[PDB]
């Protein structure tokens, strides 16, 4: 989306960071990124594979 | 069986159409338009046959 | 049938079972009739519904009865194994209740159809149909307990291991948490926990391995101290054509006295007396020779941290279980190396060629560039093959120029003679 | 089951109720078709087999060992004019088929006469028990 910037987390394995201004842009893009990776016609319990929003937060922490 | 209008197959074919599948047609079109441009010059030479 | 049973149609919990069979008779049969029709069509309507619900419940009940293994008719190991894991009397009580209920439903359907050919109004006929399917519902409502049991047994028998009582087996025994979990962990690919407490394992885990070109199966056990988990082990020792590998911990570990292992070995001695026992050690030393007083025993000292002696125990176990003109080779092949799949430096096969060129079914293999010629400029072969009614290959030979000139001599020998005038 | 790779359309010459000869040295001399495995479905149309199609067929004239049981049969000779991709239309002298298990493995040890090119391509073990191809 126009206004969301993607960088990878250095020194932490298997992490993608989504950052911008609008809540809709960042969060809908996060939702899109995990709904393309649907485990299809299989287990939920057995197949862990997928992308997941580990942390929702702010750019500048105070 | 997946239909002719099955959404996933239409999207997979759109993945095709942005690759090799259009590029070959966009080279063929240039070769066709080239020979079309070549067809003007021959007829213009047969204009200059009478103009001679 | 044979070793395992995963293939069983599921067991509905007697409330949902009603919601399956009764809804299907509402959806699959015609549902709309006027009171103003002929009595014959009203009769035939409700008869068709009572009968169809009859076949409905019977179909679901027959699936349960034929699906579950006939406990006392399978195999002595499995007859007793299911008897240990499940209350065998209750397992036969439950299936007896289904066999009873199916005959009940059959009786109900056969009753109300016979009673239905005498209905005089649509109301009377409706009351009789409602009576029939309601009666069937009452029968199925009386089955809320055995079907709840049958779903749990279906789930837990569906996950049970498949031991073969006719293949070469070897039981792995000892006190709970001796270190026999580490043995099967380091002999085969089977994930068994070595968690530091008594009853970590709760059932018979199986591990397959191959030695001397043969299929072997080593059966891990929970252990003997009586419980359903405990008696599972003992009956596995008793009914399997096997050798038993009783494991001992000559250390501070396990949390049990070695003398208690001696007492237990000599107590359980009668039922493994026929099985040719191996004992593996993972006044005081003299009481190991008290264990040696058994007719068929052998003692071995091993460590699970090293991978050689664990293999040697297997070797002796399998050995116990069995007793119970010149060719033409080109030097271009002899000098050639082996194909290592995880090597960064080797030749690229056609498999990797088609991947690099893209796709499996999209790449066309060039038959050219792979054949040997005098000039590789003429590699891209055209080869006419046909010229004017006569194919080229029939005319094609070496020395055709000299052969043509021979025919040219045969021209001039007929040229001057005067055949062409 | 058993058939190797894709299968392309050739003309249908052997409907249900057709007696073909038997070609292997198993014991049977003839074969009566009762059903064709993997056929289309029209109204009133009989199931029609062709060369290299597994049919369900019974022995009519042969050894009693091969009878008592309806078994799969792969047609090796057609005698109706089918087309090859190499120009020509061809046909054989008689209708013949060979008996096999559902897996596509042959019971007999040798097949007499010519075996069709298409049939020997599709079924590998028929070509293993073949004397003549084409």
């Amino acid at each position: 989306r126009d206004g969301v910037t993607i960088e990878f987390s250095t020194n932490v394995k298997d992490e993608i960071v989504l950052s911008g201004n609008s809540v809709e842009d960042v969060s809908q893009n996060a939702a899109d990124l995990q709904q393309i990776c649907r485990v299809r016609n299989k287990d939920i319990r057995k197949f862990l594979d997928g992308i997941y929003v580990s942390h929702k937060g702010f750019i500048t922490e105070d | 069986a997946k239909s002719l209008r099955a959404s996933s197959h239409l999207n997979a074919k759109s993945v095709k159409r942005r690759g090799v599948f259009q590029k070959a047609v966009d080279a063929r079109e240039q070769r066709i338009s080239d020979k079309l441009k070549e067809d003007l010059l021959k007829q213009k030479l047969e204009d200059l046959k009478k103009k001679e | 049938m044979q070793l395992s049973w995963k293939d069983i149609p599921t067991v509905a919990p007697a409330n949902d079972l009603l919601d399956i069979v009764l809804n299907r008779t509402q959806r699959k049969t015609p549902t709309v009739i006027r009171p103003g029709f002929k009595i014959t069509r009203i009769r035939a309507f409700y008869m068709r519904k009572v009968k169809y619900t009859g076949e409905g419940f019977v179909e679901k009940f027959e699936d349960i009865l034929k699906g579950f293994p006939n406990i006392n008719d399978v195999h002595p190991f499995h007859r007793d194994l299911m008897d240990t894991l499940y209350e065998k009397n209750h397992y036969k009580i439950s299936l007896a209740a289904i066999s009873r209920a199916k005959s009940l439903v059959e009786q109900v359907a056969r009753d109300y159809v016979r009673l239905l050919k005498f209905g005089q109004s649509l109301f009377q006929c409706k009351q009789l149909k409602r009576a029939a399917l309601g009666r069937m519902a009452t029968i199925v409502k009386k089955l809320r307990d055995p079907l709840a049991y049958l779903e749990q047994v279906r789930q837990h028998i569906g996950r049970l291991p498949s031991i073969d009582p006719n293949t070469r087996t070897l039981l792995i025994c000892g006190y709970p948490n001796v270190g026999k979990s580490s043995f099967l962990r380091c002999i085969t690919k089977s994930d068994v926990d070595v968690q530091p407490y008594a009853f970590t394992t709760k059932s018979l885990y199986v591990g397959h391995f191959d030695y001397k070109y043969l299929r072997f199966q080593a059966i891990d056990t929970p252990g003997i101290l009586m419980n359903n988990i405990e008696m599972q082990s003992i009956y596995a020792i008793a009914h399997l054509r096997s050798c038993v590998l009783y494991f001992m911990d000559l250390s501070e570990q396990c949390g049990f006295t070695i003398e208690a292992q001696v007492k237990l070995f000599h107590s359980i001695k009668p039922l493994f007396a026929n099985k040719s026992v191996m004992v593996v050690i993972n006044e005081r030393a003299q009481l190991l020779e008290s264990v040696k007083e058994v007719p068929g025993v052998e003692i071995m000292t091993s460590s699970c941290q090293l991978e050689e002696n664990v293999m040697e125990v297997r070797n002796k176990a399998c050995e116990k279980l069995l007793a119970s003109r010149t060719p033409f080779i080109p030097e271009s092949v002899k000098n050639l190396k082996k194909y290592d799949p995880e090597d960064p430096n080797r030749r690229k096969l056609a498999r990797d060629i088609e991947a690099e060129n893209g796709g499996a079914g999209v790449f066309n293999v060039n038959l050219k560039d792979k054949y040997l010629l005098e000039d590789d400029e003429w590699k891209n072969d055209i080869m006419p093959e046909i010229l004017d009614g006569k194919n080229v290959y029939d005319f094609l030979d070496p020395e055709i120029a000299a052969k043509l000139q021979a025919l040219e001599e045969e021209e001039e020998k007929l040229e001057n003679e005067g055949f062409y005038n | 089951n058993g058939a190797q790779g894709t299968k392309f359309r050739i003309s249908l010459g052997l409907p249900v109720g057709a007696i073909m000869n038997c070609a292997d040295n198993s014991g049977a001399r003839n074969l009566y078709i009762i059903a064709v495995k993997g056929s289309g479905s029209r109204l009133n149309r009989l199931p029609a087999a062709s060369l290299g199609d597994m049919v369900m067929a019974t022995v009519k004239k042969g050894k009693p060992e091969l009878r008592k049981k309806v078994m799969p049969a792969i047609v090796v000779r057609q005698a109706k004019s089918w087309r090859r991709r190499d120009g020509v239309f061809l046909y054989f002298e008689d209708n013949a088929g060979v008996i096999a298990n559902p897996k596509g493995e042959m019971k007999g040890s040798a097949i007499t006469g010519p075996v069709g090119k298409e049939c020997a391509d599709l079924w590998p073990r028929v070509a293993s028990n073949s004397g003549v191809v084409v």
Partner: protein, 341 residues
């Protein structure tokens, strides 16, 4: 039957008009989108098949192709259409000032009785510095969202005894409407070749009025045939040339022969000009005018991407049975005859 192909009635004319056109890209060079000829012919080809994944990869396949005769189409006008809430609307057509005898024939039903006074005042309308023609061409370039080319066929170069050519309308899928109308300006009275529209390995959709069978007897009785049908995805196997001998020659056969069979096609003449050898069977019969459009869209599968390597062209006698490719091979096999010597 198929309820889409209704009403199952006789068409408006033998020349069926093309219902839809390929889209438009406004960066592509100016090129024609549909072509017309005269379907007459059918013949057999063998080729080696480079279709990977198939049971016939690096094998040889025999197949039936059709020969449409396509003389070089001649441009005699241009039409401009405005985009309306009512569809399209032709606001201005412009012609070529001096048109053939064939098209002035198309404007009359009875040709011989007329004074042949068709475009006399229109050609006299041109007769100056232009002034009004350039005014109407400005009118087209200013407005008119799509621009279609008026063409006609070279009927005399075809062996047909009709003498009367067909007018048509062909849109342009070359961007900038300026370049459309100015391509037309560069092409008045001029002709357009076949291979300047098509080439080998190109999918087309040949449209034709389908072979009339007359009266016939919910599965209803009435008319069978003479319907305007569009058939899509017929691969062009060969584009040919009239002046060039050895059109029947392949990379393999290489004998100097024309694709025309011995004694020509049945009910139709030879070929004396450009042709398209299209795979399969195009609707209509022989002597029938077909209009060849191109694909509508990017239709690339491996049935559209593969290169055709033609191996041999059957030019044996269709009238009778086929035994000889050339006349030369008939009297080579035969020996010499009675009236010869």
């Amino acid at each position: 039957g198929h309820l889409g192909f209704l009403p199952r009635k006789r068409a408006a004319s033998i020349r069926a008009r093309v219902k839809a056109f390929p889209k438009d890209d406004r960066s592509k060079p100016v090129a024609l989108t549909s072509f017309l000829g005269y379907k007459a012919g059918m013949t057999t080809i063998v080729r080696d098949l480079d279709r990977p994944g198939s049971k016939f990869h690096k094998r040889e396949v025999v197949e039936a192709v059709t020969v449409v005769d396509t003389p070089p189409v001649v441009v005699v006008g241009v039409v401009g259409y405005v985009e309306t809430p009512r569809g399209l609307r032709s606001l201005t057509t412009v012609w070529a000032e001096h048109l053939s005898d064939e098209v002035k024939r198309r404007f009359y039903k009875n040709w011989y009785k007329s004074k042949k006074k068709a475009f006399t005042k229109y050609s006299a309308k041109y007769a100056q510095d232009g002034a009004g023609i350039e005014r109407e061409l400005a009118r087209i370039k200013k407005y008119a969202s799509v621009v279609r080319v008026l063409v006609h066929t070279q009927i005399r170069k075809t062996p047909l005894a009709q003498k009367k050519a067909h007018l048509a309308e062909i849109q342009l899928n070359g961007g900038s409407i300026s370049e459309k109308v100015d391509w037309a300006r560069e092409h008045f009275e001029k002709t357009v070749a076949v291979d300047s529209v098509f080439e080998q390995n190109e999918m087309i959709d040949a449209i034709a009025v389908t072979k009339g069978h007359g009266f016939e007897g919910v599965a209803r009785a009435g008319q069978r045939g003479y319907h305007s049908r569009t058939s899509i995805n017929h691969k062009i196997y060969r584009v040919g040339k009239g002046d060039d001998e050895a059109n029947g020659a392949t990379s393999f056969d290489r004998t100097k022969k024309t694709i025309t069979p011995m004694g020509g096609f049945v009910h139709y003449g030879e070929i004396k000009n450009d042709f398209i050898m299209v795979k399969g069977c195009i609707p209509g019969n022989r002597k029938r005018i077909v209009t060849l459009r191109k694909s509508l869209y990017t239709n690339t599968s491996r049935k559209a991407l593969e290169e055709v390597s033609l191996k041999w062209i059957d030019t044996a006698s269709k009238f009778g049975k086929g035994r000889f490719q050339t006349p030369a091979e008939k009297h080579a096999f035969m020996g010499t005859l009675k009236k010869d010597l």
